[PDB]
Amino acid sequence: NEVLFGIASHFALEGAVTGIEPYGDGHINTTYLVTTDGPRYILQQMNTSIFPDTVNLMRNVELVTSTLKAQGKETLDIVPTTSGATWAEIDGGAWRVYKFIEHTVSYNLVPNPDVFREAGSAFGDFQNFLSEFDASQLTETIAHFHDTPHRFEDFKAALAADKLGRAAACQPEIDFYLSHADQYAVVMDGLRDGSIPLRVTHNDTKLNNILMDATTGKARAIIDLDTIMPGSMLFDFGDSIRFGASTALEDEKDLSKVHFSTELFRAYTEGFVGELRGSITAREAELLPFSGNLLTMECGMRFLADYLEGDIYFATKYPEHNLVRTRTQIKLVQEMEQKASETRAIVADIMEAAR
Numbered sequence: 031n032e033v034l035f036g037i038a039s040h041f042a043l044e045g046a047v048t049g050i051e052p053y054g055d056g057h058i059n060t061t062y063l064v065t066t067d068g069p070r071y072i073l074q075q076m077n078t079s080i081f082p083d084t085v086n087l088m089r090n091v092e093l094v095t096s097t098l099k100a101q102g103k104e105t106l107d108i109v110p111t112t113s114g115a116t117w118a119e120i121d122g123g124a125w126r127v128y129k130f131i132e133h134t135v136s137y138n139l140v141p142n143p144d145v146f147r148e149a150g151s152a153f154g155d156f157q158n159f160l161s162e163f164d165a166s167q168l169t170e171t172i173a174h175f176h177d178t179p180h181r182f183e184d185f186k187a188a189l190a191a192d193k194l195g196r197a198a199a200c201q202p203e204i205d206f207y208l209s210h211a212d213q214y215a216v217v218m219d220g221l222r223d224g225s226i227p228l229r230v231t232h233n234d235t236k237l238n239n240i241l242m243d244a245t246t247g248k249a250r251a252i253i254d255l256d257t258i259m260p261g262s263m264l265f266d267f268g269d270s271i272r273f274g275a276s277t278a279l280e281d282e283k284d285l286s287k288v289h290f291s292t293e294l295f296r297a298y299t300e301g302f303v304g305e306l307r308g309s310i311t312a313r314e315a316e317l318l319p320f321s322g323n324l325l326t327m328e329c330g331m332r333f334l335a336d337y338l339e340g341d342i343y344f345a346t347k348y349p350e351h352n353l354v355r356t357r358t359q360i361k362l363v364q365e366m367e368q369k370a371s372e373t374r375a376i377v378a379d380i381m382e383a384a385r
């Protein structure tokens with residue numbers, strides 16, 4: 031608190047500081063709530079282990095937030111250092127301040143389809159108002175993040191190495207990913223040849239990062255912009271479907287409880303396409319369902335790769351944790367495959383309705 035107040039003094043706060051306490055349930059940044067005799071603020075110590083290049087990350091954040099503010103859209107509002115920087119290095123730490131976005135609630139899992147539709151609307155609105163932004167200006171904060179062919183090379187490397195001798199125990203899981211190999215390059219290929227628009231991508235579309243109004247329930251702002259990068263909005267949509275349209279937790283051991291919900295798929299798509307109708311392309315719309323397949327397979331192969339490497343990337347609570355996780359992702363992709371007729375119809379219906 032002595033140090034915290036000291037850190038706070040580096041920033042152009044518009045109220046005398048009266049308190050500073052840890053805040054929120056995030057686990058990458060170290061997050062504090064700053065109270066003043068006036069407005070409130072978010073103060074964060076950035077994760078420089080994961081994000082060593084703070085200058086480039088804050089440049090990305092500044093570019094996107096500025097575009098939104100210029101257009102009168104609510105977003106993260108950086109509070110500058112006394113020197114006019116967007117962040118400060120203090121005693122071997124990287125710190126930044128945002129205005130506290132007031133009067134919101136957020137979720138840690140999808141409670142129901144209405145909330146999921148509103149999550150869809152939030153990112154559709156995010157995409158819509160960045161549709162004119164030159165996404166290529168953004169640096170790749172985590173290289174190859176949703177480059178599924180790259181992830182598959184990582185997976186194959188982990189399989190070849192088989193450092194723990196675990197491959198013997200997951201042949202069906204391995205064969206699932208090997209057999210789908212010709213599917214991984216669909217979105218990367220479209221970006222490279224222009225058939226799929228290069229857009230801003232958020233890359234952590236979990237609901238924790240979507241603030242909704244505390245009274246109306248309506249989407250308010252997208253936060254947690256650390257992983258903002260160029261890519262396809264399909265990377266974001268696909269991932270939201272992966273975690274959000276599942277009837278189960280990511281590590282559900284009972285696979286009979288794991289299903290791909292077309293109701294939740296419809297809900298997100300209604301919200302998302304409803305805000306992005308004027309910008310979304312024919313090829314994009316066509317790939318909405320498959321984007322769910324793609325990002326789910328990417329995530330699943332990463333879990334299985336981690337299992338084979340001795341669980342070095344994802345936290346685990348028991349020895350087979352990553353294998354259990356890879357299994358839910360496999361189950362979800364199989365249902366998405368089997369429901370392709372339905373989801374295609376859902377998208378087509380939603381597209382025409384939005385007009």
Ligand SMILES: Nc1ncnc2c1ncn2[C@@H]1O[C@H](COP(=O)(O)OP(=O)(O)O)[C@@H](O)[C@H]1O
Pocket residue numbers: 053054055056057058059060061072106107128129130131132136238239253254255256
């Ligand atoms: N500008 C802000 N206004 C209000 N709440 C915020 C703001 N920034 C972050 N939060 C809250 O702090 C939590 C963690 O912050 P976030 O930037 O998502 O960190 P992490 O990268 O660790 O997830 C969020 O889940 C959100 O509830």
Ligand SMILES: [Mg+2]
Pocket residue numbers: 056238239254
């Ligand atoms: Mg977050």
Ligand SMILES: [Mg+2]
Pocket residue numbers: 058059234254256
């Ligand atoms: Mg984050």
